[model samples]
Target: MEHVAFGSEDIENTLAKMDDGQLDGLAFGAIQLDGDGNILQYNAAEGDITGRDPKQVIGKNFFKDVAPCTDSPEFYGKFKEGVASGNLNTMFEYTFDYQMTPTKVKVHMKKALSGDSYWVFVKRV
Candidate 1:
């Protein structure tokens, strides 16, 4: 088994700084979702990335608002299968039309003991 070290305070400080735009030129968001895809934690960084505030995104369905591109039967179906089989990390690249410059994003999916959610990190290429 592989072990990783993540200090909570360190991570919190890092996230705080990153949220304030002090960590490179990247923006990030953290969400906690239910097994059924319901959203829980929607942070400010998510608002900056999606142009939708956390208030607007929290309590809503994640796949519906944040990444509708993955809502398709084919794509989400595979995702569901992977999650059901306990795949810890799933990653893929996608492009969005809203940014006017063809924003490319990497979607990383993970399952937490609390639920299923993601910490989405974005950077411009």
Candidate 2:
């Protein structure tokens, strides 16, 4: 895993500046999840990247169904810890080999304060 590219002190700071739609408009993919990891917001970019529909994922468990590859300790484990610590901000490079189209990516996982949300920002490489 490598460091995330959108490093500007705090990625959360930028997210604080934008709304859901604005976040979706970015070139990269974005998925917002609830405390339980249920998809709350699935952006346009994410749909195209994963080749999955927003309707099917909107209320599903992200780690369990949406991207089970991340369900392991290396990914979802940190997410659980972040929720508890209330300081969950993480970024790492990962590969999406599950897809027939394998691509490398930089994944940013941070816990948002407002609405008690957790965000996953995927920077496709």
Q: Please list the Cα RMSD from the true structure of every candidate, rounded to 1 decimal place.
A: 7.1, 4.3
Clashing pairs in 2: none
Query: Which has the greatest lDDT?
Result: 2
The C-alpha stretches of model 1 lying farther than 4 A from their native spots are 1-27, 73-75, 98-102, 115-125
Using TM-score as the measure, the top candidate is 2
Model 2 spans with C-alpha error above 4 angstroms? 1-5, 17-20
In terms of lDDT, the poorest run of 10 residues in model 2 is 1-10
**Structural similarity to truth (TM-score) of each candidate:** 0.60, 0.82
C-alpha positional error of residue 18 in candidate 2 after TM-score superposition, expressed in Å? 4.4
- Expressed as tens digits, the lDDT of each residue in 10-89 for candidate 1 is 33234443333233233454555666666666656556656666667667776775667667654466557656776545
Among residues 3 or more apart in sequence or in different chains, the pairs in candidate 1 whose N, CA or C atoms overlap within 3 Å are none
Number of backbone clashes in candidate 2: 0
